[PDB]
Amino acid sequence: GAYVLDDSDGLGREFDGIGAVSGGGATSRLLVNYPEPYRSEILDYLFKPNFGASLHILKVEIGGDGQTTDGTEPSHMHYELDENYFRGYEWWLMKEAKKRNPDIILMGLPWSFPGWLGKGFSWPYVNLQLTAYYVVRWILGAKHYHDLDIDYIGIWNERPFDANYIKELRKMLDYQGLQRVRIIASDNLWEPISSSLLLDQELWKVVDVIGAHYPGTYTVWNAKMSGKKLWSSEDFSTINSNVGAGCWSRILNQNYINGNMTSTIAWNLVASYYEELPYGRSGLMTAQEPWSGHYVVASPIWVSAHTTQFTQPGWYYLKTVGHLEKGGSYVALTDGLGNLTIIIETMSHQHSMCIRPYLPYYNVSHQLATFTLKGSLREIQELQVWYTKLGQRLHFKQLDTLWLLDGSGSFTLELEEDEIFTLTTLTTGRKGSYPPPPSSKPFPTNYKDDFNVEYPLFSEAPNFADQTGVFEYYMNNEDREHRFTLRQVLNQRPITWAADASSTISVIGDHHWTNMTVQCDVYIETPRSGGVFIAGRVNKGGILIRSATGVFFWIFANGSYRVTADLGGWITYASGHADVTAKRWYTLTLGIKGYFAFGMLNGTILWKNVRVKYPGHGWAAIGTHTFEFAQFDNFRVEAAR
Ligand SMILES: *[C@@H]1O[C@H](CO)[C@@H](O[C@@H]2O[C@H](CO)[C@@H](O)[C@H](O)[C@H]2NC(C)=O)[C@H](O)[C@H]1NC(C)=O
Ligand SMILES: *[C@@H]1O[C@H](CO)[C@@H](O[C@@H]2O[C@H](CO)[C@@H](O)[C@H](O)[C@H]2NC(C)=O)[C@H](O)[C@H]1NC(C)=O
Ligand SMILES: *[C@@H]1O[C@H](CO)[C@@H](O[C@@H]2O[C@H](CO)[C@@H](O)[C@H](O)[C@H]2NC(C)=O)[C@H](O)[C@H]1NC(C)=O
Ligand SMILES: *[C@@H]1O[C@H](CO)[C@@H](O)[C@H](O)[C@H]1NC(C)=O
Ligand SMILES: OC[C@H]1NNC[C@@H](O)[C@H]1O
Numbered sequence: 222g223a224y225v226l227d228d229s230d231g232l233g234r235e236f237d238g239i240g241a242v243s244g245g246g247a248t249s250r251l252l253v254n255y256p257e258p259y260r261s262e263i264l265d266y267l268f269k270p271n272f273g274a275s276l277h278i279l280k281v282e283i284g285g286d287g288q289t290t291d292g293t294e295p296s297h298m299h300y301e302l303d304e305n306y307f308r309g310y311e312w313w314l315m316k317e318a319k320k321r322n323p324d325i326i327l328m329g330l331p332w333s334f335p336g337w338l339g340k341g342f343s344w345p346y347v348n349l350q351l352t353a354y355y356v357v358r359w360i361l362g363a364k365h366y367h368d369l370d371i372d373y374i375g376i377w378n379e380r381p382f383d384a385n386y387i388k389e390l391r392k393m394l395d396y397q398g399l400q401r402v403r404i405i406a407s408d409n410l411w412e413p414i415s416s417s418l419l420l421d422q423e424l425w426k427v428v429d430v431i432g433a434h435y436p437g438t439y440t441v442w443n444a445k446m447s448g449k450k451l452w453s454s455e456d457f458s459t460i461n462s463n464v465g466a467g468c469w470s471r472i473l474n475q476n477y478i479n480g481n482m483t484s485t486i487a488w489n490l491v492a493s494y495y496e497e498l499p500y501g502r503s504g505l506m507t508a509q510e511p512w513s514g515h516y517v518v519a520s521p522i523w524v525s526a527h528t529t530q531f532t533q534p535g536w537y538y539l540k541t542v543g544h545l546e547k548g549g550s551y552v553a554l555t556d557g558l559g560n561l562t563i564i565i566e567t568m569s570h571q572h573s574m575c576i577r578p579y580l581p582y583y584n585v586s587h588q589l590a591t592f593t594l595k596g597s598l599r600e601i602q603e604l605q606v607w608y609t610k611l612g613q614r615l616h617f618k619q620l621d622t623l624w625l626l627d628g629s630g631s632f633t634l635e636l637e638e639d640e641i642f643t644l645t646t647l648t649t650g651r652k653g654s655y656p657p658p659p660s661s662k663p664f665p666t667n668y669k670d671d672f673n674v675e676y677p678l679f680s681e682a683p684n685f686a687d688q689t690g691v692f693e694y695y696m697n698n699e700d701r702e703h704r705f706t707l708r709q710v711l712n713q714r715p716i717t718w719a720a721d722a723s724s725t726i727s728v729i730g731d732h733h734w735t736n737m738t739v740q741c742d743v744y745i746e747t748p749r750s751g752g753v754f755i756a757g758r759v760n761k762g763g764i765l766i767r768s769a770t771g772v773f774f775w776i777f778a779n780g781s782y783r784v785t786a787d788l789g790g791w792i793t794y795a796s797g798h799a800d801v802t803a804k805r806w807y808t809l810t811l812g813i814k815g816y817f818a819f820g821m822l823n824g825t826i827l828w829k830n831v832r833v834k835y836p837g838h839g840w841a842a843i844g845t846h847t848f849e850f851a852q853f854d855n856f857r858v859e860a861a862r
């Protein structure tokens with residue numbers, strides 16, 4: 222009926238911010254080669270204050286060279302004694318975010334680790350000092366090379382934590398003058414981290430935040446007992462249709478209401494990865510076409526705005542928050558300066574399902590809500606109004622100012638389902654706008670890269686999405702024809718997060734492609750045992766990269782070749798001998814049309830008319846037989862979709 226909003230008996234918990242995740246894995250991959258002005262517009266929609274999503278928090282993967290859901294991300298230490306703070310795109314992303322919002326909150330978290338850290342095992346806790354050293358080096362490098370202060374460091378994404386590790390990490394941070402960096406644990410379930418904090422005073426002292434993943438808006442008693450900040454440190458992960466926007470809307474409110482969670486962070490920030498990779502289009506917005514410049518400012522961008530534009534880290538929740546009698550919810554926040562923001566959501570069950578977890582049916586119907594301002598809030602006589610109706614739809618439209626002339630300190634709204642209202646004393650709101658970007662277009666049916674770039678802006682060529690191993694721009698001054706190539710740089714399997722393939726592979730192009738010719742120059746660096754391939758119709762990647770089928774054309778340095786239907790090479794289409802050795806450049810051509818394929822070595826037919834599964838479709842790819850050095854040059858693909 223009537224809902225009292227008051228601060229007279231005190232406040233709720235301090236609000237910590239809303240944010241999102243770039244990484245886990247390669248989610249921002251296709252954003253970096255967007256042309257201007259579009260790339261900048263996109264970043265504005267995400268990070269510019271009083272414009273779009275206006276995010277408070279940006280969380281990034283600390284790359285460890287392993288597959289971490291939609292690709293691999295490069296580490297700052299590929300090998301022991303290697304340090305490089307200019308690989309990948311997270312440094313870049315953090316700097317761009319910080320340009321737009323200097324007060325943005327930055328977090329880092331590992332999914333995978335380089336293999337050499339395991340000292341013979343695929344386990345990051347064999348040598349605690351070494352793994353901590355690796356992680357703290359990343360934080361120092363953020364400061365020293367990019368001028369970034371990292372605000373939070375995590376442990377091991379959705380993987381077990383080690384209590385001694387967390388203690389060592391704290392000790393190591395302090396030792397490096399990083400006392401201001403805070404630790405969040407354990408980026409998995411509420412347990413066992415929450416009970417561990419109650420049983421262990423030394424652990425409790427070194428953990429600042431408990432971050433849980435996909436909590437379904439609820440927490441647990443031990444976490445409440447701990448007296449720590451509780452965050453939903455990863456959530457969302459749903460397609461950014463109106464449905465995903467509903468999910469995002471409902472949980473932004475009800476994570477605090479049901480779970481005492483004072484921050485929620487979406488996976489992922491922006492869908493800049495091929496859609497046919499796992500969890501396609503599950504960012505706050507979509508930017509998966511750098512070749513065309515087309516992006517989509519999806520509904521979740523404006524759902525975020527209803528909170529982010531009108532709240533800031535350091536505001537407090539009121540004690541008076543809760544559910545609406547006939548479905549939906551409301552929260553209210555103040556800054557202690559006389560401002561007040563009220564956020565109301567009436568998301569229906571059928572239009573707000575998240576993938577994790579799936580809620581049992583709940584009912585939402587039309588209602589009227591009366592709000593009365595008590596305490597220091599009663600003196601407010603004016604409120605700005607912002608409204609969204611999820612579809613057709615109607616996004617972040619500003620409505621007529623609401624007045625409380627009465628002295629009643631009270632007002633009433635008619636609510637329907639799937640709506641959001643934000644009522645705030647703040648006048649800075651804005652639905653940011655750029656002109657529409659170019660129309661969507663498929664990946665170019667003809668495409669080439671000679672990798673001839675002497676001072677590349679990024680460490681890898683555009684559109685190549687690594688799904689196992691890591692491929693990088695390589696300069697070899699000792700060669701003239703192949704001075705600038707693409708190189709696979711891992712020489713051992715990472716401490717894996719997902720199930721990386723046995724073979725390295727990078728995919729590119731249009732998953733719809735079914736007839737195609739792929740050509741590339743390849744160089745095998747390992748004598749006798751080495752091998753490489755090119756391929757087409759590659760149908761799976763990411764977390765499923767081991768499942769990938771297609772047509773794979775391998776040559777080996779022992780004078781041999783293979784044609785397989787799968788990346789794992791279990792299934793044979795054809796095989797035989799070839800004049801192939803190590804440390805020599807060959808040109809491979811692979812042609813696939815309907816039921817048949819052919820391969821060429823240096824322009825001369827090696828095998829022809831080999832029958833392959835059809836129908837079938839997928840990306841083009843390059844790669845190596847194991848985790849081994851190899852080079853590639855003059856990539857070309859022609860395809861029909
Ligand atoms: C966490 O939030 C819950 C609400 O979900 C708080 O628990 C109580 O909530 C009921 C209504 O659901 C109120 O009537 C009680 O007043 C709340 N408890 C108290 C002690 O006020 C709970 O307080 C919160 N825990 C914190 C802030 O540590
Ligand atoms: C609401 O918030 C605004 C912005 O934080 C407050 O305005 C600021 O007030 C501080 C001091 O209180 C000044 O130093 C800033 O220059 C002000 N900034 C702007 C943009 O006005 C405002 O006082 C708060 N309270 C109300 C009732 O609006
Ligand atoms: C890919 O190539 C196959 C093989 O040529 C094409 O399939 C043939 O299409 C013609 C005319 O469309 C038919 O008369 C043949 O019977 C088809 N062959 C088979 C085995 O189905 C296919 O259309 C091509 N696809 C694209 C997108 O170019
Ligand atoms: C939802 O609530 C309305 C109002 O009480 C009711 O008429 C309707 O049957 C409910 N729907 C379900 C599925 O229970
Ligand atoms: O929904 C899938 C997400 N889960 N958390 C880890 C992330 O990298 C994603 O795989």
Ligand SMILES: [Ca+2]
Pocket residue numbers: 671672673702703704705706854855
């Ligand atoms: Ca070249």
